[PDB]
């Protein structure tokens, strides 16, 4: 149980909830100067699945924020409603959008209380948050099931996160990262990590966050808009095989 | 419509001395222009050293004394001693402010002995503001008794006088003289005069008749 | 009754207030201050019932400073105004309603100066100038007469002085001395007090 | 009722009547309207005597616990705001209190007026009761922060005397106190009939 | 063996062992004796000290002007039940202005202590009481048990080594009725003495007495007020 | 009587309270030194990861103008304790207009932690806190709080991985001489943090408070200067004079 | 009266494939004007607006608490709101205070975001909707605006004429109400554009 | 055993065992044609005494939403009631009939309420929720975990794998509501251990006109491999 | 039977309550002595580092101007019970306007131990003060059992200290002599050099309030040892 320490000062339910995320789909984020994006993989791959929704794993929380999740999905549907309530409570209280760190603190204060108060299970969900505010600009955060958030410039959660992290360490070009550069890196990291090869456009989900005339924008790239990103990858690594 | 109060008459008096304390009262109980009974004393013995008088609405007079009697036993259980006059007074001050927004319509006078044998008289309002005094009157004729006590005990507006301390035999005659006169002008002051004297030897009682008109 | 006055300019917000607390007929204090410093670039001036003013204003300043502690940066004046107006309005149909008339003044690096008027019914409105009390009826005509949006600090203080001379002439109460304070990009500054040698 | 208090060079003076009244009848003329809250704090009584006494005894109960928990004597401002926030939770229910809190702390001589309505003001001169307006005049023409101690005593005594002369619900004795850095000290208890002789001829 | 760790569990033989174990906590306290004549009721206890240089534990408690108890078992249960009794008697004087009978108090005590025997999350009261009182039906001596049961008694002793006192009382019951107070107290003291070793004897320090009667409120005699009652005891050999 | 419940042991121990201190023996080292008009604490850094914004790894956290705080142990429990202390720092100015003192809020935090050792269904806060600050009368203060709800006052202390080795350092070194100026009070903390550090200087973060100033976190441009001064004063004394 | 403590005036009027909405710009206590740029029309989406006349506290409170619900709605939902449904949301919001009522009488005007047919509605302070097909009014000058819209309104009106109609009604109505005026603002909303105008009005 | 407990692998075991109770219930088919949705299931009795016109595995929630399940009928009758209440709450607030996706969300919330406390077991049912909103058909699949999936066709219960491969090899778009019923009955005929009668199955369809449970006559019509 | 406070042993015992007693011997030792001139309290501090300010180790405290406490055991239990005693002593003043006796403070503080909070308090306390009945010393135990004592020692070396007090104690002593005896006993149960920071000492006389000794007054008795 979660209200019990180990002799070595450990909390093993909090570690098992964190081990319950590698079973979930891979989701990464990439920060840039022009914007910030997310990239999830759709393990819901089947000939009879419909895909009615706008997006299955990218959830919009505010006019200036979205999130992606990995882990237990019921827990995600709980936390995504709580996030949307926190944002609107801040708006009602101040009539200004909530910054992209107060929301993460507010959700992590909920996640911390489940590791501490008797008969309830820690949320087996990690999250990534992308958003804009008038204090620090474009941001990217990463929550854990223990109630620990951290700011990042590029991170990955879920299956094969430790490999995408090593790739981003070896290909991120801080200070010179546009949004086309970030998507070109995403299509690479998400192809050198997926078990199913060739990276079908049906098997991914991408969202970009940008600004236009003092308004925030959160779009979702369509199928044909991602086919181009894929086609401009095998060409790129076919040229890195020409020089034999 | 239903008003929860009614004035049942009553008059009470207390005088303190260096080795004694008196608490007196009439015995008439009234209701408007009628008379309920002519044997209903307003004095109640609490301890061997302490006596209380109660005047006003009679239901509160009955409730409050029972509350006091139930608190004395709890004090004795917890502290293994009987209470003092000042402790009872300070406790009653809180019991009365417990009802600050629905008060006990009761005019109270405590009379007993200090912790070195001297007299002690504590007079209360219906909401618990208390005041140690040498003599105090309370009830319907309170406006009639206190001037003569101010004169014949405090020696006020009297020059070149012997400021003699009040002995018990003088105090008792004085106490009888004031009710004999309050029964002539106040219509609530009635049939008998109960007097409870407190001394180091114990507590006595005396009944003296008044006019039944 | 008590008097507040506020004036907004292109790069500043001037505010004043009387320094009088009063029992039935006598003045109990002449060194009184009705301003409450919420932040380095926000003020709150409050008038109303005796206890509601200090309780309400202390609550708001603590809940505004707690923002700075938790988050590391200030609240805007537009956000503090709506926090104040949300807490004044939740309490209105309750068992503890605050009867308080107040101004709010501040400066932000992005939006510039701001002045907000509020009534005891929690209706927020930003204006270029504003007043409270029975002196408003006299001193709002002078502001409408002589105020311009490009008014400078030195002329703003002269307009204020005229507004208070009109109180000393016509107003049925004394109001002998006044606090004066100004806000700008460099914070709050306690200007010299506009007094009147009545006695 | 009539009370007054002013703070000057050598601390705070406190004076008061001794009369209680229920309409036209004079119930008591030996009332102690200055409440010894602690050995280092003083109160006054004006309005509800039962309200003044109860809530200031409750204030004492918290001041002592403060001193025990923290091993430091409370301030005058803190002692005043305790009482104010306590009597603000009964606003409109019908309490009547007007009382000054007097004392010396690390900031200096302190004087604070607290009302059941919710006022809480710091000042150098205050008077409360029906006879307050008759004391304000004398105490205003006769004030100076550089007063001497006996002069301050005389001022307080004569202001209470002149207030008792006019007001009907004010009389009896004049009980005068003096707040210092070594605590407070009771000075006098002077009948108004005595001072009548000396201040007439 | 394994129907013992809870009071809500029966055994295959129809027994609750936690209650039987709570009854064993009365045998850990010092011995008390209770007895009654037709006019008076007496409790005599033997007090026990923790360190030699301390005061003896108080064994007899005042409940009202006509009821008093002597306790053997856990101190905390006794302190809770005494405060229950005191308020139940004050509640009777407040309403009816009469003293509460003793049968109607011990019935309430049983009704109170029956709950921990049946609901889980509460411990059975591991204290036994001997209750001496006087009402409109004469003197009474009541035993109260951790099993939520209670008995009306001519006399009784409870605590460690109380079978000796019980054996003594069982063969002198025919005298207690017409005994005066001195003889009754002496029978109690002798029954108590029968619980000691032959080494020890009764002393002012380790004897408390409680008496109630028609013209006598419940009084307690502890240290030097006991020496009248000790004078008269035959110096027993062994 | 063994692990897994806060009941007791035959020896008279509560092991779930010791196992929480064992979590405080697992975080990063955090030291604190009390001077006359400067008070300095420093905390080891958390091994940055080449793609992380370190603006959010705040180990040192202010509670009011006069009081500050540094913690070791669980990172999330720290945030709740710090917010619940920040609230009380303002509720204390509401209840009485005076500001707060260091012992008041230390006592409050310790009571909050004590409250979580009383019930099952509540887990103790797995942190300690060095709570340094100022007062009226300008008396510098330093306290240390453990999960069990115990608080003491210290001239200098340490918490985390390596506190058992920094305590010996400060035992051998802390005197009235090393608190002559502010620059000597800071060099002591630098040398103490060096005893567990990466032999760097970029793995250090120090803050200071004066009777006048508010909290002031240092930049590496001064940390490097202090560390170079300390490296020079040790190249000259320990080596070039022995 | 209550709602006359602050004043106000709101009107809505349909055309053919368009709709209008108008309000005065004054904020004042009983008889004193404080501010002349007070908001009383609030957007609730593109091609959908709402207007509020009554007690200003309740205006701001209702607008904020409705934007709360609308944002949560269109987040859970994946679609912008229809006017018929905003009407019922407001009705529920107001009937929740059936004995603590907000002192407002809203006016809604919009176009359905698929077929773009116009909609206009009115509600009372406890939420009885009123879906007319000509015009709706709420405020202190309700009779004066009924009298103008009854006489000037025509069934089919292009925006150039609808603007003139809804302006000449509002101006001549608020010019006979003492606590309404100090400016008039108008919104015209079509499938392709939203036009917004402030008008030359009396400031007495 | 316990439900508020993770395994070291990071699995919730009682949820996995509640899905095993779904995997052993009667089969249920679901197909989403272009102009409708079909729901079909096996309603077979243990004797000739059971009156089959008294209980229903196909139930309506509204005029335009309907249900089937695989697993436990007692658990089904709770979620039927809850869904019927939630639809009416939505109507009471908005005066619009609830969309088929919001009901699935609010019902998975109910299924998730029973996954987080101790002293409660999850539901032993999965659902298939058909609808017709905004001129488009819908079909979802709610699970005891609190998770839902939108399908074009699927099968739950006994032999839910071969019954799904059959649909993968024998289902496409450009169908209509009558070509899909034949396919659903053919997908049920795989597991039918006996002669399929009009009373051994139960069928419900949704379309522009709304949801309707077919009658035994209509079942016997298409049971002849007709349409 | 060992774990849980709602479980009786076959012999009718509560082992958790006894293990709460055993938590007192893990605390340093304290001594209290009655005398007709007053009461004394004397304790060891057990400083673990020279860096900690030993004045932050509250092992003797003021409950009121006429009652002082000395404790041994868990710190949290002690904080709770000391706050209880302080609050009760002032509620008594508020109601009755007099000083609570040491017996009644002890009685009221022991009533919290009678509450299964879910755990017995792991702390014993000595209460020294002056009443109408003169100087009084009391001892409270985790079982809520309290009794008047003439001399008592609690804590780690309570056995040897008690086995010495029974010899050096008589009911005729003075306070200066009892203070000397207490420190002589304290000297013998310490493997650290007795000094004016390793101990506290307090007294409560009739005509004087609670008074914790200073370094000067302490060294001026350490010298005559």
From Swiss-Prot, chain B:
GO terms for biological process: proteasome-mediated ubiquitin-dependent protein catabolic process; proteolysis involved in protein catabolic process. The keyword Glycoprotein applies. Glycans are attached at residues 30, 181. Keywords: Acetylation, Cytoplasm, Deafness, Glycoprotein, Host-virus interaction, Intellectual disability, Nucleus, Phosphoprotein, Proteasome. PROSITE patterns: PROTEASOME_BETA_1, PROTEASOME_BETA_2. CDD domains: proteasome_beta_type_1 (cd03757). It is found in: Cytoplasm; Nucleus. The modification Phosphotyrosine is found at residue 122. Its main location: cytoplasm. One of its GO terms (cellular component) is nucleus. The modification N6-acetyllysine is found at residue 176. Non-catalytic component of the 20S core proteasome complex involved in the proteolytic degradation of most intracellular proteins. This complex plays numerous essential roles within the cell by associating with different regulatory particles. Associated with two 19S regulatory particles, forms the 26S proteasome and thus participates in the ATP-dependent degradation of ubiquitinated proteins. It is linked to Neurodevelopmental disorder with microcephaly, hypotonia, and absent language: An autosomal recessive disorder characterized by microcephaly, intellectual disability with absent speech, severe developmental delay, short stature, and hypotonia. Affected individuals also manifest aggressive behavior and have hearing loss. Belongs to the peptidase T1B family. This is Proteasome subunit beta type-1. It comes from Homo sapiens.
Curated annotation (Swiss-Prot), chain C:
GO terms for cellular component: cytoplasm; cytosol; extracellular exosome; membrane; nucleoplasm; nucleus; proteasome complex; proteasome core complex. CDD domains: proteasome_beta_type_2. The keyword Membrane does not apply. Induction: Up-regulated in ovarian cancer cell lines. SUPFAM superfamilies: N-terminal nucleophile aminohydrolases (Ntn hydrolases) (SSF56235). Belongs to the peptidase T1B family. This is Proteasome subunit beta type-2. It comes from Homo sapiens. The gene is PSMB2.
UniProtKB/Swiss-Prot annotation, chain G:
Gene3D superfamilies: Glutamine Phosphoribosylpyrophosphate, subunit 1, domain 1. Keywords: Acetylation, Cytoplasm, Host-virus interaction, Nucleus, Proteasome. It is found in: Cytoplasm; Nucleus. The 26S proteasome consists of a 20S proteasome core and two 19S regulatory subunits. The 20S proteasome core is a barrel-shaped complex made of 28 subunits that are arranged in four stacked rings. The two outer rings are each formed by seven alpha subunits, and the two inner rings are formed by seven beta subunits. The proteolytic activity is exerted by three beta-subunits PSMB5, PSMB6 and PSMB7. (Microbial infection) Interacts with HIV-1 TAT protein. Belongs to the peptidase T1B family. PANTHER family: METALLOPROTEASE TLDD, PROTEASOME SUBUNIT BETA TYPE-3. This is Proteasome subunit beta type-3. It comes from Homo sapiens.
From Swiss-Prot, chain H:
One of its GO terms (cellular component) is proteasome core complex, alpha-subunit complex. It is found in: Cytoplasm; Nucleus. Coiled coil: none annotated. The modification Phosphotyrosine is found at residues 17, 69, 114. Phosphorylated on tyrosine residues; which may be important for nuclear import. InterPro entries: Ntn_hydrolases_N, Proteasome_alpha, Proteasome_alpha-type, Proteasome_asu_N, Proteasome_sua/b. NCBIfam families: PRK03996.1. Component of the 20S core proteasome complex involved in the proteolytic degradation of most intracellular proteins. This complex plays numerous essential roles within the cell by associating with different regulatory particles. Associated with two 19S regulatory particles, forms the 26S proteasome and thus participates in the ATP-dependent degradation of ubiquitinated proteins. Belongs to the peptidase T1A family. This is Proteasome subunit alpha type-2. It comes from Homo sapiens. The gene is PSMA2.
């Amino acid at each position: 149980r979660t209200t019990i320490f180990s002799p070595e000062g450990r909390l093993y339910q909090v570690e098992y909830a964190m081990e319950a995320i590698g079973h979930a789909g891979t989701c990464l984020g990439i920060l840039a100067n022009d914007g910030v994006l997310l990239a999830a993989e759709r393990r819901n791959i089947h000939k009879l699945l419909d895909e009615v929704f706008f997006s299955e794993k990218i959830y919009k929380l505010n006019e200036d924020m979205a999130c992606s999740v990995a882990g237990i999905t019921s827990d995600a549907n709980v936390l995504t409603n709580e996030l949307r309530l926190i944002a609107q409570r801040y708006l009602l209280q101040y009539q200004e959008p909530i910054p992209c760190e107060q929301l993460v603190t507010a959700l992590c204060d909920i996640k911390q209380a489940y590791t501490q108060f008797g008969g309830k299970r820690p949320f087996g969900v990690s999250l990534l948050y992308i958003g804009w505010d008038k204090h620090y600009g474009f941001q990217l955060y990463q929550s854990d099931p223990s109630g620990n958030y951290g700011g990042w410039k590029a991170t990955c959660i879920g299956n094969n996160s430790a490999a995408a992290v090593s790739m981003l360490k070896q290909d991120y070009k801080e200070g010179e990262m546009t949004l086309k550069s970030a998507l070109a890196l995403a299509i690479k990291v998400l192809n050198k990590t997926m078990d199913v090869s060739k990276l079908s456009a049906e098997k991914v989900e991408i969202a970009t966050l940008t600004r236009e005339n003092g308004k925030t924008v959160i779009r979702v790239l369509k199928q044909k808009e991602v086919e181009q990103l894929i086609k401009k990858h095998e060409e790129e690594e076919a040229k890195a095989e020409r020089e034999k | 419509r239903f008003s929860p109060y009614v004035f049942n008459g009553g008059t009470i008096l207390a005088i303190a001395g260096e080795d004694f304390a008196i608490v007196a009262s009439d015995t008439r109980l009234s209701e408007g222009f009628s008379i309920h009974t002519r044997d209903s004393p307003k004095c109640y013995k609490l301890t061997d050293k302490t006596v209380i008088g109660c005047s006003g609405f009679h239901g509160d007079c009955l409730t409050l004394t029972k509350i006091i009697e139930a608190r004395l036993k709890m004090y004795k259980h917890s502290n293994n001693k009987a209470m003092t006059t000042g402790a009872i007074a300070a406790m009653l001050s809180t019991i009365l402010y417990s009802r600050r927004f629905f008060p006990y319509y009761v005019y109270n006078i405590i009379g007993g002995l200090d912790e070195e044998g001297k007299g002690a008289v504590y007079s209360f309002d219906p909401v618990g503001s208390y005041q140690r005094d040498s003599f105090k009157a309370g009830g319907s004729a309170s406006a009639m008794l206190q001037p003569l006590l101010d004169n014949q005990v405090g020696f006020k507006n009297m020059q070149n006088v012997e400021h003699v301390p009040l002995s018990l035999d003088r105090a008792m005659r004085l106490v009888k003289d004031v009710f004999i006169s309050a029964a002539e002008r106040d219509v609530y002051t009635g049939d008998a005069l109960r007097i409870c004297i407190v001394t180091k030897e114990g507590i006595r009682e005396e009944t003296v008749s008044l006019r039944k008109d | 009754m008590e008097y507040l006055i506020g004036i907004q300019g292109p790069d500043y917000v001037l505010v004043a207030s009387d320094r009088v607390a009063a029992s039935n007929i006598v003045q109990m204090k002449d060194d009184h201050d009705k301003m409450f410093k919420m932040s380095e670039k926000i003020l709150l001036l409050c008038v109303g019932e005796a206890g509601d003013t200090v309780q309400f204003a202390e609550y708001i300043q603590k809940n505004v400073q707690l923002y700075k502690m938790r988050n590391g940066y200030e609240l805007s004046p537009t956000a503090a105004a709506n926090f104040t107006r949300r807490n004044l309005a939740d309490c209105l149909r309750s068992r503890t309603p605050y009867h308080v008339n107040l101004l709010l003044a501040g400066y932000d690096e992005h939006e510039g100066p701001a002045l907000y008027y509020m009534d005891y019914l929690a209706a927020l409105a930003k204006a270029p100038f504003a007043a409270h009390g029975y002196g408003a009826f006299l001193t709002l005509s002078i502001l409408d007469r002589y105020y311009t949006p490009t008014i400078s600090r030195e002329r703003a203080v002269e307009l204020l002085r005229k507004c208070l001379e009109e109180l000393q002439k016509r107003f049925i109460l004394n109001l002998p001395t006044f606090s004066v304070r100004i806000i700008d990009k460099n914070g709050i500054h306690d200007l010299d007090n506009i007094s009147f040698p009545k006695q | 009722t009539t009370t007054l208090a002013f703070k000057f060079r050598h601390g705070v003076i406190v004076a008061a009547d001794s009369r209680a009244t229920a309409g036209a009848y004079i119930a008591s003329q030996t009332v102690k309207k200055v409440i010894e809250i602690n050995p280092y704090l003083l109160g006054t009584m004006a309005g509800g005597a039962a309200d003044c006494s109860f809530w200031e005894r409750l204030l004492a109960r918290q001041c002592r616990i403060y001193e025990l928990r923290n091993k430091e004597r409370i301030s005058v401002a803190a002692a005043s705001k305790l009482l104010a926030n306590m009597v603000y939770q009964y606003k409109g229910m019908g309490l009547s209190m007007g009382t000054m809190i007097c004392g010396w702390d690390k900031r200096g001589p302190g004087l604070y007026y607290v009302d059941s309505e919710g006022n809480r003001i710091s000042g150098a001169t205050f008077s409360v009761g029906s006879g307050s307006v008759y004391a304000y005049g004398v105490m205003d023409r006769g004030y100076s922060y550089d007063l001497e101690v006996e002069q301050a005593y005389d001022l307080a005594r004569r202001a209470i005397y002149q207030a008792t002369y006019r007001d009907a619900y004010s009389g009896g004795a004049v009980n005068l106190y003096h707040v210092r850095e070594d605590g407070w000290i009771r000075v006098s208890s002077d009948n108004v009939a005595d001072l009548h002789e000396k201040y007439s001829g | 063996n394994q129907y013992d760790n809870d009071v809500t569990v029966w055994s295959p033989q129809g027994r609750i062992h936690q209650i039987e174990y709570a009854m064993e906590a009365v045998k850990q306290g010092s011995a008390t004796v209770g007895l009654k004549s037709k006019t008076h009721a007496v409790l005599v206890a033997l007090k026990r000290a923790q360190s030699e240089l301390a005061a003896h534990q108080k064994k007899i408690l005042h409940v009202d002007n006509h009821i008093g108890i002597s306790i053997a078992g856990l101190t905390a249960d006794a302190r809770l039940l005494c405060n229950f009794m005191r308020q139940e008697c004050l509640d009777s004087r407040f309403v009816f202005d009469r003293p509460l009978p003793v049968s109607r108090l011990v019935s309430l005590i049983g009704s109170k202590t029956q709950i921990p025997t049946q609901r889980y999350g509460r411990r059975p009261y591991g204290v036994g009481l001997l209750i001496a009182g006087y009402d409109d039906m004469g003197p009474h001596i009541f035993q109260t048990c951790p099993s939520a049961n209670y008995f009306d008694c001519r006399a009784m002793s409870i605590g460690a080594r109380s079978q000796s006192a019980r054996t003594y009382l069982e063969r002198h019951m025919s005298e207690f009725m017409e005994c005066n107070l001195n003889e009754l107290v002496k029978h109690g003291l002798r029954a108590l003495r029968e619980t000691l070793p032959a080494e020890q004897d009764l002393t002012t320090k380790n004897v408390s007495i409680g008496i109630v009667g028609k013209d006598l409120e419940f009084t307690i005699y502890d240290d030097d007020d006991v020496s009248p009652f000790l004078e008269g005891l035959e110096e027993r050999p062994q | 009587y063994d692990r897994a419940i806060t009941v007791f042991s035959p020896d008279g121990h509560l092991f779930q309270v010791e196992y929480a201190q064992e979590a405080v023996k697992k975080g990063s080292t955090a030291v604190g030194v009390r001077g006359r008009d400067i008070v300095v604490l420093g905390v080891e850094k958390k091994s940055v990861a080449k793609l992380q914004d370190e603006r959010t790894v705040r180990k040192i956290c202010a509670l009011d103008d006069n009081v500050c705080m540094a913690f070791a142990g669980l990172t999330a429990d720290a945030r709740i304790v710090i917010n619940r202390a920040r609230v009380e720092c303002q509720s204390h100015r509401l209840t009485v207009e005076d500001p707060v003192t260091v012992e008041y809020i230390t006592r409050y935090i310790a009571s909050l932690k004590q409250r979580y050792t009383q019930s099952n269904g509540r887990r103790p806060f797995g942190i300690s806190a060095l709570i340094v600050g100022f007062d009226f009368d300008g008396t510098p203060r330093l306290y240390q709080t453990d999960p069990s709800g115990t608080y003491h006052a210290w001239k200098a202390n340490a918490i985390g991985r390596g506190a058992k080795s920094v305590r010996e350092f400060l035992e051998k070194n802390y005197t009235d001489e090393a608190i002559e100026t502010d620059d000597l009070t800071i060099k002591l903390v630098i040398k103490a943090l060096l005893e567990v550090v990466q032999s760097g200087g970029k793995n250090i973060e120090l803050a200071v408070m004066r009777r006048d100033q508010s909290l002031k976190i240092l930049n590496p441009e001064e940390i490097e200067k202090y560390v170079a001064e300390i490296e020079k004063e040790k190249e000259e004394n320990e080596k070039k004079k022995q | 009266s209550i709602m006359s403590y602050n004043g106000g005036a709101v009107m809505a009027m349909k055309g053919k494939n368009c709709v209008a909405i108008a309000a005065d710009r004054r904020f004042g206590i009983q008889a004193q004007m404080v501010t002349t740029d007070f908001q009383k029309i609030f957007p609730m989406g593109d091609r959908l607006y709402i207007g509020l006349a009554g007690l200003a506290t309740d205006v701001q409170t209702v607008a904020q608490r409705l934007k709360f619900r609308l944002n949560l709605y269109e987040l859970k939902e994946g679609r912008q709101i229809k006017p018929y449904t905003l009407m019922s949301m407001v009705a529920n919001l107001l009937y929740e205070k059936r004995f603590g009522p907000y002192y407002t009488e809203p006016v809604i005007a919009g176009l359905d975001p698929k077929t773009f047919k116009p909609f206009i509605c009115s509600l009372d302070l406890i939420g009885c909707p009123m879906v007319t097909d000509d015009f709706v009014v709420s405020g202190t000058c309700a009779e004066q605006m009924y009298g103008m819209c009854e006489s000037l309104w025509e069934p089919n009106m292009d925006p150039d004429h609808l603007f003139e109609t809804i302006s000449q009604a509002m101006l001549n109505a608020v010019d006979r109400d003492a606590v309404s005026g100090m400016g008039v603002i108008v919104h015209i909303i079509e499938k392709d554009k939203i036009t917004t105008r402030t008008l030359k009005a009396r400031m007495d | 055993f316990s439900l508020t407990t993770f395994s070291p692998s990071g699995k919730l075991v009682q949820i996995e065992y509640a899905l095993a109770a779904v995997a052993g219930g009667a089969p249920s088919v679901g197909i989403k044609a272009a102009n409708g949705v079909v729901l079909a299931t096996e309603k077979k009795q243990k004797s000739i005494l059971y009156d089959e016109r008294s209980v229903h595995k196909v139930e309506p929630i509204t005029k335009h939403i309907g249900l089937v399940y695989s697993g436990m009928g007692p658990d089904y009758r709770v979620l039927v009631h809850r869904a019927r209440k939630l639809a009416q709450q939505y109507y009471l607030v908005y005066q619009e009939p609830i969309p088929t996706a919001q009901l699935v969300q609010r019902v998975a919330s109910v299924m998730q309420e029973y996954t987080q406390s101790g002293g409660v077991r999850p539901f032993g049912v999965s659902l298939l929720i058909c609808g017709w909103n905004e001129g488009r058909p819908y079909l979802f699949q709610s699970d005891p975990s609190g998770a839902y999936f939108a399908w074009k066709a699927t099968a739950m219960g006994k032999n839910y794998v071969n019954g799904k491969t059959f649909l993968e090899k024998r289902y496409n778009e450009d169908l209509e509501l009558e070509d899909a019923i034949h396919t659903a009955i053919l997908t049920l005929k795989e597991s039918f251990e006996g002669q399929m009668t009009e009373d051994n199955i139960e069928v419900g369809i949704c379309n522009e006109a709304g949801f309707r449970r077919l009658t035994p006559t209509e079942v016997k019509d298409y049971l002849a491999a007709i349409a | 039977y060992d774990r849980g406070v709602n479980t009786f042993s076959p012999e009718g015992r509560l082992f958790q309550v006894e293990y709460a007693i055993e938590a007192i011997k893990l605390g340093s030792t304290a001594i209290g002595i009655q005398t007709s001139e007053g009461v004394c309290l004397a304790v060891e501090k057990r400083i673990t580092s020279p860096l900690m300010e030993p004045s932050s180790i509250e092992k003797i405290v003021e409950i009121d101007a006429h009652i002082g406490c000395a404790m041994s055991g868990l710190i949290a239990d002690a904080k709770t019970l000391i706050d209880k005693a302080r609050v009760e002593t002032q509620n008594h003043w508020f109601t009755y306007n007099e000083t609570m006796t040491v017996e009644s403070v002890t009685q009221a503080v022991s009533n919290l131990a009678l509450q299964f909070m879910s755990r017995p308090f792991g702390v014993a306390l000595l209460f020294g003060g002056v009443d109408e009945k003169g100087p009084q010393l009391f001892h409270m135990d985790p079982s809520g059992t309290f009794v008047q004592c003439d001399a008592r020692a609690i804590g780690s070396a309570s056995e040897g200290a008690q086995s010495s007090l029974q010899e050096v104690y008589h009911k005729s002593m003075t306070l200066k002599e009892a203070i000397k005896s207490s420190l002589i006993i304290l000297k013998q149960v310490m493997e650290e050099k007795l000094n004016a920071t390793n101990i506290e000492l307090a007294t409560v006389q009739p005509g004087q309030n609670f008074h914790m000794f200073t370094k000067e007054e302490l060294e001026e008795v350490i010298k005559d040892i």
